[PDB]
């Protein structure tokens, strides 16, 4: 959601302490620094190839993945650069010896590496507090398509 403009604030944004040397003459110009996050998560090429900055990106920024690694389907993609994961689960109650279907949401930051839509299953790593509620950061959109290419029925 949103994206595209690159350098488009009142300020103008670079990867901090990282340098695009004007004396030196490379083809890339912008020396794209990137992070390997680990835990058996690949750096998506969208992150390394592209252009966007983000402090709050875990691959092109200063946020570091650590602690818990959740997953979950995405409910809302409406806000800018963050997603609302919805982490369904069961709560036991011993008096009856059955379960509930319980809710909890997780507002997590999404790096423009990934395209995230509504109803996409998303793996998400814990990190620094990014904002008020955003303490989580998306690392792997599992449902890349989810029947996107194969929508039409006719032969």
């Amino acid at each position: 959601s949103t994206e595209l403009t690159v350098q488009s604030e009142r300020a103008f944004q670079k990867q901090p302490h990282i340098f695009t040397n004007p004396k030196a003459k490379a083809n890339r110009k912008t020396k794209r620094w990137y992070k390997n996050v680990g835990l058996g998560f690949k750096t998506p090429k969208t992150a390394i190839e592209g252009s966007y900055i983000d402090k709050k990106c875990p691959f092109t920024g200063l946020v570091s993945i650590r602690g818990k690694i959740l997953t979950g389907t995405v409910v809302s993609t409406r806000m800018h650069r963050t997603i609302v994961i919805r982490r369904d689960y069961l709560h036991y109650v011993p008096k009856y010896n059955r379960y509930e279907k319980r809710h909890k949401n997780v507002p997590a930051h999404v790096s423009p590496a990934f395209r995230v839509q509504v109803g996409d299953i998303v793996t998400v790593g814990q990190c620094r507090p990014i904002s008020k509620t955003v303490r989580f950061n998306v690392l792997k959109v599992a449902s890349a398509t989810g029947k996107a290419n194969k929508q039409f029925a006719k032969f």
Binding site: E9, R10, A11, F12, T20, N21, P22, K23, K132, T133
Partner: protein
């Protein structure tokens, strides 16, 4: 008094979080410094763990740095030229981190005259050789040259002077510099 509590701030949903405990010192946040440019003044403040934390007040001067050459100097500031958070800091002229400023530049020029010694704006026999060996390395990006000529180099200050006390920053080069210039133009 001025606190950094997430106790207050209703909630993620909206429910009014009741005043659980009287706010603590470890949660505190002090009054803003908002350093101008008008006589050199500093006041420290005894922080957590003791640890003094110099608050710039009306700070003149600071070492603004080149990238291409790899240098900085005992250089004066002129004025707050463009601050990208808020324009109220340009009327009042309150120097801050990542505010764009104009640099006295004379010191820089002097340094250059030692370093390369070719002059910007427009002896001894073995030192000639040295000079020859140096120079024609950095051609400089036009705007910078103009600034030098003027006596007013475009920088962005990147030391946080309300925390650090020092007002040390960065001579603007390349794309970012260009953007800043554009912004300035738009403003004026």
């Amino acid at each position: 008094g001025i606190s950094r509590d997430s106790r207050h701030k209703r909630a993620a949903t909206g429910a009014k979080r009741a005043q659980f405990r009287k706010k603590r010192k470890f949660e505190l946040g002090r009054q803003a410094a908002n350093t101008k440019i008008g006589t050199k003044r500093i006041h420290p403040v005894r922080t957590r763990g003791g640890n003094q934390k110099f608050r710039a007040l009306r700070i003149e001067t600071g070492n603004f740095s080149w990238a291409s050459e790899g240098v900085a100097r005992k250089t004066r500031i002129t004025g707050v030229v463009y601050h990208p958070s808020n324009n109220e800091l340009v009327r009042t002229n309150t120097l801050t981190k990542a505010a764009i400023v104009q640099i006295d530049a004379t010191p820089f020029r002097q340094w250059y005259e030692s370093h390369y010694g070719q002059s910007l704006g427009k002896t001894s026999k073995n030192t000639e050789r040295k000079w020859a060996a140096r120079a024609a390395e950095a051609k400089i990006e036009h705007a910078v040259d103009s600034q030098f000529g003027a006596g007013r180099l475009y920088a962005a200050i990147s030391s946080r002077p309300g925390q650090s006390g020092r007002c040390d920053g960065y001579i603007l080069e390349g794309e970012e510099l260009a953007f800043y210039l554009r912004r300035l133009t738009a403003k004026k």
